[PDB]
Amino acid sequence: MLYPEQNEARLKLSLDGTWAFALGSCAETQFDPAKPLPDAQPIAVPASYNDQNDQTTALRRHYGWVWYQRKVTLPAFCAGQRVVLRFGSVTHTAKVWLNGQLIAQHKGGFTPFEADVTALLQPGETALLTVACDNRVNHSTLPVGNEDGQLAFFGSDNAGIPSVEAAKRAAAPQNRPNFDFFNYAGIHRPVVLYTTPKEYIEDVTIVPAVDGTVQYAVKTTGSAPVRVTVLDADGNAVASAESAEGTITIPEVHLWEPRPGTPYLYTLHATCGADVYDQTFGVRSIEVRGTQVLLNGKPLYFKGFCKHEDFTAHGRGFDPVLNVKDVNLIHWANANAVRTSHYPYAEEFYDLCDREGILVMDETPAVGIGGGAAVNPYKEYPLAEHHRQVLAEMIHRDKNHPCVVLWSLGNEPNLEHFPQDAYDYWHPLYELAHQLDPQDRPVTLVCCQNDYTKDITTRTMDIVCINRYYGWYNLSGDMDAACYGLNQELDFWAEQHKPVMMSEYGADTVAGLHTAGAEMFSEEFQVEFYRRLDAEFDKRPWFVGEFVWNFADYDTVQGPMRVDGNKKGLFTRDRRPKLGMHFLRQRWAEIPTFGFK
Amino acid sequence: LYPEQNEARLKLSLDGTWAFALGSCAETQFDPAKPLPDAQPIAVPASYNDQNDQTTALRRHYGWVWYQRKVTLPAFCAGQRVVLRFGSVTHTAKVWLNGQLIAQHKGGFTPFEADVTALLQPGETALLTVACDNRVNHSTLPVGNEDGQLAFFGSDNAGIPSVEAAKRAAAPQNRPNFDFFNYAGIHRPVVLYTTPKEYIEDVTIVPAVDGTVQYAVKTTGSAPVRVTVLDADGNAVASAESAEGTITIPEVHLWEPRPGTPYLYTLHATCGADVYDQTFGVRSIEVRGTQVLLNGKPLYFKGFCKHEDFTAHGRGFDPVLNVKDVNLIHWANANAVRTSHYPYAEEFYDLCDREGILVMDETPAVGIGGGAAVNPYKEYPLAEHHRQVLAEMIHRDKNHPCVVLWSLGNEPNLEHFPQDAYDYWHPLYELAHQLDPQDRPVTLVCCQNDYTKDITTRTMDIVCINRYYGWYNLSGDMDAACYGLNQELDFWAEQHKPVMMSEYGADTVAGLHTAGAEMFSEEFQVEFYRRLDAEFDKRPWFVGEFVWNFADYDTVQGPMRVDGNKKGLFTRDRRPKLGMHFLRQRWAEIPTFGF
Amino acid sequence: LYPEQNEARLKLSLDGTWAFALGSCAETQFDPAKPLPDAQPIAVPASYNDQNDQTTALRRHYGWVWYQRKVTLPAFCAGQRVVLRFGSVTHTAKVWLNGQLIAQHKGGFTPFEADVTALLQPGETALLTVACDNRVNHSTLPVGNEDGQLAFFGSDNAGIPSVEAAKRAAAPQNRPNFDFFNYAGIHRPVVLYTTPKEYIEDVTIVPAVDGTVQYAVKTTGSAPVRVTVLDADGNAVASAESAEGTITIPEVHLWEPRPGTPYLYTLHATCGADVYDQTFGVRSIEVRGTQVLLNGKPLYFKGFCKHEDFTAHGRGFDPVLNVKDVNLIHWANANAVRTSHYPYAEEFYDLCDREGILVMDETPAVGIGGGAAVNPYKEYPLAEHHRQVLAEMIHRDKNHPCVVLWSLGNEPNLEHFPQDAYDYWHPLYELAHQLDPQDRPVTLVCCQNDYTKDITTRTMDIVCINRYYGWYNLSGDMDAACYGLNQELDFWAEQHKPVMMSEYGADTVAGLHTAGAEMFSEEFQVEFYRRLDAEFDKRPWFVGEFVWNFADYDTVQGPMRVDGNKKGLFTRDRRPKLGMHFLRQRWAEIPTFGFK
């Protein structure tokens, strides 16, 4: 699964634009892909479909299948290449025809897929590309959705009342998601159409080392001799080797480091027959040593945001302008890292962090594996094979980024009500992710506020990541006692001799609400919350990271808990800094990336 | 009796900037006779919570607070009986004069008096001290929550030991079992007034509509009592000589809300050297079948649930805000107010008297419950204090024509113990018809509950229910909210009773718009009322609708409250949100009479 | 012509994240062939000004910026004519390939091209450098102010020594003579496309309601040229074997805004090995008295004024925000859009063709005016560049059925120098009618002025006026504002032309409410429209209204602009203010056709 490129051998064709679009139902065969769409309407690809037609609320709240369609043409002179149709993502479940013939089926809303379409797209001809896109989440999806009888996350019900219960049964069906973010759906990521030679490079793995030695492995279909070359930032070749497997060594290697370091990127240049492909990479080690996490031997402190792919009109769709703006505000913040809650992000996000020196915690879309104390999801939720394919999909896709340093299997699963079952499920995936990563990066699992003594799985990861809303969801409004309770749990974590990071924490804040006394939802409360809890972090040397929730304000399900979306952002949805961001900025103005300990 | 000034009585407000000190839980921490140490100024009347922001001490106080101020009776003001009166002190009080305990009172929204004629003589300067306790709990109205119970609408992570250690070690703090902030202090005006040594004590006026007006004045002296009825211009149109009986008003003017004219006569009553005027209006209220007749005409309640809440003032009295809020009711085309969740200042009912505004009057009895695990009617020492408070209110507000309905309390647990609750509320519904000379209708505002197990809500003279379909349940889907509402309505039709929706609303942050009418946005508020009100108007037995709330108000901190309650149709500074303009337009098309 | 992809032509996107350095006032600073020094990543297309908040250097830059990336044409993509196309660069560009200049352009909202096959061979990689100058002055369109004038709506304490000394020592900034922020950068999609080495050059389609369609296809080769009208489903309904001539369509389905159906045909043209498809719409436009006729029907415009403006994107192009707006435009019961104050991306006009939305196409000709002290008609070197950009606009949009009305420009000083004003504008009125095959109405949008001394705007084919009664004058008093509006309307009645109100609105902050509808509150926006709109309806020659603005947009800092202009009926993130629900109801009850 290599990201598409444009060189002397390969053409990159963007199929993005404004396709024809039609709502469907729960019937998966409701339209004939070979024939045009009936009563189509224009829709912008890539982006969610949800916030694109406010003539009614049918698009925003839709339940089931939607249908995309556009014509694609290969000019007649683009002769005898191998042609591939590639989707960066389709959310959540996709089906894909060309001229009526099925050419793809994908599950998973956040990892890419392809179809080798050379036999159905000759030079000169025109095809009808139809994509069906199912938005339904349930006990088999990742992220998990809930099914009849349960509610959505942070739901509010008057459970026993007849009038409500008859209504729920008479109510129109709608996804009820076991996660706190809006269920955006559609073609979110750029649809590419590209060419390679008939016999092509098809996978590149790169495992580097801080002394300057780099292991590499270039997989191919044909029989040409492979030759590689390593290029510097200027484009000059500085080493070379002439086999498909082996090691190559860069004299005076420049190491990849987040600011104040230089995020120095190298290119591996692989030729083989008529084919060419340029794999980017950086030379940097990561070792967990005891209760430290070392980058090039220096002890790291994570100053990071939890983010989301979320924006006005684009929804969960991709936006490079947003990406550049967002990274620069991270540099503005004096932050150095990002967590990709709660799904792998668009490919281009990690290229930007590569280029811009920002550590990343790559997370699978495995949020919501939990049903309460009377529902064991590990026994009752059919997720383990989808988990394994998508865990693999992510590692295979970002294996070559220096900006990734930490794998996260998933988010806030029920680790307390059935401990050993949870260990038996999550540990097979902790091992897997270590078998699957050629660089052996540390693995984690991000955990709920929960009874940490009943929990037996969190402490067994390479780096412990905890989500703690002390003084917000519990002991509300009182940072005296919030700080007390946090420190109790921090004494428990001191006993586990692992490095620990606070991986979510935050306080819903409405931009505009001020109060002399720093009460809940006001801007001044957010400053108290972080400032108070942050000063206890600094008393513990085995605390090595803080990830605030959230970077910015994002949309959500309707419900009395969420003031038109989540509001714990340190920025508003248009990336405007609240009072709490100026506090964070000053704090990270005085905490160095390296050597905080 | 509300203090007056005339040729017989002097009135005198002690309102002003008093001295003030923070207390603890010792009701004996300061010497009520020596000046308060380390005092600081404080405005009376007002809550004290929002008057000092140097720290969060006053806003978040737990316990007693102390006021002090010198009072002086001019020597030339002699031969009179001297009365110390407080309009309210929230919640429990204890007053001393030069060290002497002259009053104690429990309950933060009813008034109490002390006769001080022998402790303050003309020419004397005496030292007034008041102790004020803000604490709420299982003995209070409104009800608090003692150890091991969350504040109402609160949030926890129940069992995590780290959270559990933090609770046992945390600073104590009231946990209201009611969704508003526990503002405390001297809220209504203090007053020093004088009467003749033999004075008029009590006036009851039961007026009927033919013109006949039963009456009864209670005098301490021996002089004969004569009364004259003064019409709106102050003209004697009839008179009588006897402390009790009947005067007929020739050609009565009936009291009515807009459109009607709100006509108020006065009972001029003299006994000896003494005078007192009781305003009164002449109108009938009868519950006949599934209708509520006002002066024989079938009535509809375009109502507001209000609060007593405003910037700085807290729960304090603001006469200005009163005039404002009442001209906004009139701008809205509304006619009725529910006094959530306590009796208001008297001046409010005197304004509703003159301005033509129906009033549902309500006690502080909110939060009488604690889940299916706790029986409050077996566990909470309330029943006694609840009959006193109901007595105080009916006795205080009996002569107001604006009051057309009493409510026993707001949202008790009526379902988890169906018969235990009938055994507590029905004597009160009985007591309420007894103390009221005008046999006004009685209700009890029911929270959202299993209406099929509740046996006591349907037993009221008018039924009054609080429903949030689309908001707390079935969030965001008004298709499903109306379906569920109509299902409960199908039950209320079989009960052949008059039925009013006595709370319903949706938090709305002024500012947030969505084309799609999404919870917390100004447009969802419109869809809420527009879709629920439509389903109402299909029910010919459904006589009233009081929107919650008139205006945003403070609450205790909690992840469910965006700096207080935001379901107001107005902001706190009384600017209207989009759903107000919608409501005001709907009520311009709904007549108060004959709908 | 707009780039296409078929069996004949390839269309590649050079959009993406490029390398970007800040320059200065040196056209000479960095070498166009060597890579940029201390470059940073930047997203293209979009404005650059809101993309690095580490600093305010990008937001507030004065001068040149530099863009760069590498361009490889694969080895197998051989033997074709390869063209490089910029959807726009704002405002002036120099573009180099491998160090060799290949384009220059003045004009920030119109596309430009460079034929490049001679320098991008199959298989190689060229270094493509774009330098973009953001400076506006008395020679640009839109107009910038020069030494000793303030920014439009700017404030000053003129004459104070400390002030006048600081105004001189201050770092140089642009002072726009317009009310919208000076976004700059490569704003529109950057294309690399191919044609057979002898190719279709230009297409010109004039349709008439009777079925007949006059057409013309310019070519460079010598092959013969086939045309075939294709229907909404793609079937061929007419045909000809000639590069000019006319063809007849049977039961032609016409193009109409809603409630009509916006039917769209294609002219499929082959010549040699080359293909091109030009959409077109069959509908008649006739100013006939004080009516404007669409297929003979009296028409009433329910329009917005828009802007190309958004969070992060700046004036960059956003295909998603475009589909959301057009759908909010339907939801509003609106049928028209004004391209204030510049031509938009081509894809916006493609959208309106499909969606059925009447457009009014405006040049970047805003700010031709410097008050009473200065005669721009004698002192601003604008004349030739106006004619240039007038033509660029009309060539590019000539086949769109949605464009019903040309606007030569916006808010020019028409009263201090009345006669110079006409001699400058009336040739451009004539030019627009010459350069346009379908001969559509042409207008000129007039700021609020003394209309008894304006000799110019009452001579356009449709009178369009910007009035702000009850806002900038007679403030907060709608009783008086209708009085004033009504006295000016009595003057336009005497002129016997059709009249539209092309701008009017009131700054409204979302969530400011007042019972009594005071200025800046949502309730006053409702009042401002409801009151003025009541007088529009009493008069049969008033044929349209265009509110300002569709949405809040950014603007340069001055004490009269609350973080932008806030006259939007929608907020920047497209949430409807109380003023919007009112207009949505008003347009509910007013037909597109036959209101007057």
PDB file of C-alpha atoms in Angstrom, chain A residues 54 57 60-61 156-158 160-164 166-168 170-172 449-452 470 472-478 481 484-485 488-489 510 513 515-521 558-564, chain B residues 53 56 59-60 155-157 159-163 165-167 169-170 448-452 469 471-477 480 483-484 487-488 509 512 514-520 557-563:
ATOM      1  CA  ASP A  54     -29.076  22.338   4.338  1.00  0.00           C
ATOM      2  CA  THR A  57     -31.831  17.883   7.437  1.00  0.00           C
ATOM      3  CA  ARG A  60     -27.124  15.655   8.083  1.00  0.00           C
ATOM      4  CA  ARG A  61     -29.070  12.896   9.835  1.00  0.00           C
ATOM      5  CA  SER A 156     -29.891  11.059  28.476  1.00  0.00           C
ATOM      6  CA  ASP A 157     -33.044   9.022  28.983  1.00  0.00           C
ATOM      7  CA  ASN A 158     -36.100   8.722  31.198  1.00  0.00           C
ATOM      8  CA  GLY A 160     -38.940   3.390  32.406  1.00  0.00           C
ATOM      9  CA  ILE A 161     -41.728   5.739  31.290  1.00  0.00           C
ATOM     10  CA  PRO A 162     -44.285   4.222  28.862  1.00  0.00           C
ATOM     11  CA  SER A 163     -44.605   7.353  26.733  1.00  0.00           C
ATOM     12  CA  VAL A 164     -40.833   7.396  26.125  1.00  0.00           C
ATOM     13  CA  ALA A 166     -43.245   3.504  22.932  1.00  0.00           C
ATOM     14  CA  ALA A 167     -41.689   6.562  21.307  1.00  0.00           C
ATOM     15  CA  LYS A 168     -38.211   5.018  21.157  1.00  0.00           C
ATOM     16  CA  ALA A 170     -41.792   4.211  17.078  1.00  0.00           C
ATOM     17  CA  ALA A 171     -38.853   6.601  16.593  1.00  0.00           C
ATOM     18  CA  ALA A 172     -37.007   6.847  13.305  1.00  0.00           C
ATOM     19  CA  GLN A 449     -11.286   6.985  33.962  1.00  0.00           C
ATOM     20  CA  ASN A 450     -11.979   3.708  35.777  1.00  0.00           C
ATOM     21  CA  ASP A 451     -11.213   1.676  38.871  1.00  0.00           C
ATOM     22  CA  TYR A 452      -7.498   1.365  38.157  1.00  0.00           C
ATOM     23  CA  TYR A 470     -10.705  15.031  37.770  1.00  0.00           C
ATOM     24  CA  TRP A 472     -14.849  18.015  35.652  1.00  0.00           C
ATOM     25  CA  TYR A 473     -16.889  14.811  35.440  1.00  0.00           C
ATOM     26  CA  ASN A 474     -16.262  14.043  39.118  1.00  0.00           C
ATOM     27  CA  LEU A 475     -15.767  16.390  42.091  1.00  0.00           C
ATOM     28  CA  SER A 476     -17.010  19.072  39.758  1.00  0.00           C
ATOM     29  CA  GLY A 477     -15.802  22.650  40.197  1.00  0.00           C
ATOM     30  CA  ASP A 478     -13.254  21.993  42.977  1.00  0.00           C
ATOM     31  CA  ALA A 481     -10.147  18.014  45.797  1.00  0.00           C
ATOM     32  CA  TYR A 484      -6.168  15.446  45.869  1.00  0.00           C
ATOM     33  CA  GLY A 485      -7.845  12.611  43.997  1.00  0.00           C
ATOM     34  CA  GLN A 488      -3.903   9.312  45.037  1.00  0.00           C
ATOM     35  CA  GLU A 489      -4.084   7.662  41.616  1.00  0.00           C
ATOM     36  CA  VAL A 510     -17.641  28.423  25.829  1.00  0.00           C
ATOM     37  CA  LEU A 513     -18.082  33.123  29.237  1.00  0.00           C
ATOM     38  CA  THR A 515     -16.257  34.745  35.619  1.00  0.00           C
ATOM     39  CA  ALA A 516     -14.158  36.346  38.339  1.00  0.00           C
ATOM     40  CA  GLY A 517     -14.295  33.126  40.316  1.00  0.00           C
ATOM     41  CA  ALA A 518     -13.340  30.599  37.600  1.00  0.00           C
ATOM     42  CA  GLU A 519     -16.520  28.504  37.490  1.00  0.00           C
ATOM     43  CA  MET A 520     -17.295  25.589  35.195  1.00  0.00           C
ATOM     44  CA  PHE A 521     -17.578  26.383  31.412  1.00  0.00           C
ATOM     45  CA  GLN A 558     -27.235  15.900  19.922  1.00  0.00           C
ATOM     46  CA  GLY A 559     -27.663  15.568  23.676  1.00  0.00           C
ATOM     47  CA  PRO A 560     -27.989  17.542  26.869  1.00  0.00           C
ATOM     48  CA  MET A 561     -24.324  17.017  27.627  1.00  0.00           C
ATOM     49  CA  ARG A 562     -22.801  18.592  24.497  1.00  0.00           C
ATOM     50  CA  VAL A 563     -23.376  22.268  23.753  1.00  0.00           C
ATOM     51  CA  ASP A 564     -23.678  21.794  19.972  1.00  0.00           C
TER      52      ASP A 564
ATOM     53  CA  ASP B  53     -14.905  38.851  44.324  1.00  0.00           C
ATOM     54  CA  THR B  56     -14.478  33.116  46.144  1.00  0.00           C
ATOM     55  CA  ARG B  59     -19.905  32.940  46.659  1.00  0.00           C
ATOM     56  CA  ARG B  60     -18.990  29.477  47.947  1.00  0.00           C
ATOM     57  CA  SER B 155     -21.917  13.994  38.083  1.00  0.00           C
ATOM     58  CA  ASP B 156     -19.602  11.415  39.634  1.00  0.00           C
ATOM     59  CA  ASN B 157     -17.383   8.437  38.892  1.00  0.00           C
ATOM     60  CA  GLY B 159     -16.592   3.853  42.872  1.00  0.00           C
ATOM     61  CA  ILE B 160     -13.028   4.809  41.955  1.00  0.00           C
ATOM     62  CA  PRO B 161     -11.174   4.879  45.310  1.00  0.00           C
ATOM     63  CA  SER B 162      -9.208   8.002  44.334  1.00  0.00           C
ATOM     64  CA  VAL B 163     -12.456   9.889  43.764  1.00  0.00           C
ATOM     65  CA  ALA B 165     -10.959   9.482  49.100  1.00  0.00           C
ATOM     66  CA  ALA B 166     -11.222  12.947  47.594  1.00  0.00           C
ATOM     67  CA  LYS B 167     -14.904  13.209  48.585  1.00  0.00           C
ATOM     68  CA  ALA B 169     -11.503  14.789  52.411  1.00  0.00           C
ATOM     69  CA  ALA B 170     -13.135  17.605  50.440  1.00  0.00           C
ATOM     70  CA  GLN B 448     -41.339  13.610  34.522  1.00  0.00           C
ATOM     71  CA  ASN B 449     -42.201  10.169  35.878  1.00  0.00           C
ATOM     72  CA  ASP B 450     -44.052   6.921  35.353  1.00  0.00           C
ATOM     73  CA  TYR B 451     -47.453   8.616  35.350  1.00  0.00           C
ATOM     74  CA  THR B 452     -49.174   5.215  35.552  1.00  0.00           C
ATOM     75  CA  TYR B 469     -39.777  15.301  25.530  1.00  0.00           C
ATOM     76  CA  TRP B 471     -34.698  17.414  25.647  1.00  0.00           C
ATOM     77  CA  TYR B 472     -33.953  14.982  28.520  1.00  0.00           C
ATOM     78  CA  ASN B 473     -35.409  11.997  26.654  1.00  0.00           C
ATOM     79  CA  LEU B 474     -35.547  11.484  22.886  1.00  0.00           C
ATOM     80  CA  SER B 475     -32.935  14.203  22.532  1.00  0.00           C
ATOM     81  CA  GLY B 476     -33.104  16.278  19.367  1.00  0.00           C
ATOM     82  CA  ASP B 477     -35.921  14.374  17.584  1.00  0.00           C
ATOM     83  CA  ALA B 480     -40.410  11.359  18.520  1.00  0.00           C
ATOM     84  CA  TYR B 483     -45.318  11.055  19.657  1.00  0.00           C
ATOM     85  CA  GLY B 484     -44.280  10.381  23.239  1.00  0.00           C
ATOM     86  CA  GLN B 487     -49.004   9.116  24.478  1.00  0.00           C
ATOM     87  CA  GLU B 488     -48.976  10.649  27.959  1.00  0.00           C
ATOM     88  CA  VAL B 509     -27.126  29.746  24.233  1.00  0.00           C
ATOM     89  CA  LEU B 512     -25.657  29.616  18.489  1.00  0.00           C
ATOM     90  CA  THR B 514     -28.009  26.108  13.083  1.00  0.00           C
ATOM     91  CA  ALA B 515     -30.040  25.721   9.928  1.00  0.00           C
ATOM     92  CA  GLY B 516     -30.888  22.279  11.307  1.00  0.00           C
ATOM     93  CA  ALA B 517     -32.421  23.172  14.750  1.00  0.00           C
ATOM     94  CA  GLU B 518     -29.893  21.403  16.896  1.00  0.00           C
ATOM     95  CA  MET B 519     -29.940  21.249  20.675  1.00  0.00           C
ATOM     96  CA  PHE B 520     -28.624  24.442  22.391  1.00  0.00           C
ATOM     97  CA  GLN B 557     -21.349  24.033  39.010  1.00  0.00           C
ATOM     98  CA  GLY B 558     -21.882  20.863  37.019  1.00  0.00           C
ATOM     99  CA  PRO B 559     -21.173  19.479  33.565  1.00  0.00           C
ATOM    100  CA  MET B 560     -24.877  19.748  32.741  1.00  0.00           C
ATOM    101  CA  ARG B 561     -25.192  23.509  33.336  1.00  0.00           C
ATOM    102  CA  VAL B 562     -23.428  25.976  31.034  1.00  0.00           C
ATOM    103  CA  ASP B 563     -22.752  28.551  33.755  1.00  0.00           C
TER     104      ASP B 563
END
